[PDB]
Amino acid sequence: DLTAFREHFAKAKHIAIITGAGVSAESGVPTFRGPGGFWRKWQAQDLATPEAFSRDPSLVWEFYHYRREVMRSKMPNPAHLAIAECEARLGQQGRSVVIITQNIDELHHRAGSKHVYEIHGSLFKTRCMSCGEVKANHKSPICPALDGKGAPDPNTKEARIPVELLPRCERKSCNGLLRPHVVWFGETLDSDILTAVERELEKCDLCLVVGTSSIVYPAAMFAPQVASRGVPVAEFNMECTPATQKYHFEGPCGSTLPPALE
């Protein structure tokens, strides 16, 4: 019931919005998980690990370069924009909106959202494997050796770029190999980020879960905590629920969300 949701929305002083891959799939952005989610022979699972990076860093960089380069043509969608403009409008009234996103595509930033927690990192940040420094990077191509590489067709030959020529740390005395500042499979989420997220969730009085589910991860971490404070949680996602089923708006969030958040 949209009207009942909007009654809560009108009153809410602190809204937490959690976003998953559905909001990024609708911008034309491949996940690489599941059906057709291949890049050359591999799926995300096979590449987004420290073992892949240790054993074939050129291959893993080709994959991330491809993804960075594809983002240039993908644009934020009406769901991302509604979220950003909602934050702006409510912020002017002293009402707080924060976005907690699983997505690494930075589309929320491009849409205009300011208060964003990227819990899985970003395609457009690097971390130095030597000195640990994190730096924003939108350079196209990230380094000359990667220029025009990363083709996704399975019979593409590997670039086999020497490690010295992959993206390097620019504080010249270090010069360490850079990696994407993304959380990989088998790695822990940042504790500092999680403590900030816990504080926001504990203060919020309405929570939305967009393009994922309350019951899958990462949403399953957060949303119980908010529900147990008695706070309404509203899902916007394409997934069905039974009819023998706190709010669920079924469909593409780029349709549902601008209406719900207007």
Binding site: H120, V183, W184, F185, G186, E187, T188, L189, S191, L194, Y217, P218, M221
Partner: peptide, 8 residues
């Protein structure tokens, strides 16, 4: 620290 997916 929390494994992503829970390491699933």
């Amino acid at each position: 620290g929390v494994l992503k997916e829970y390491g699933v």
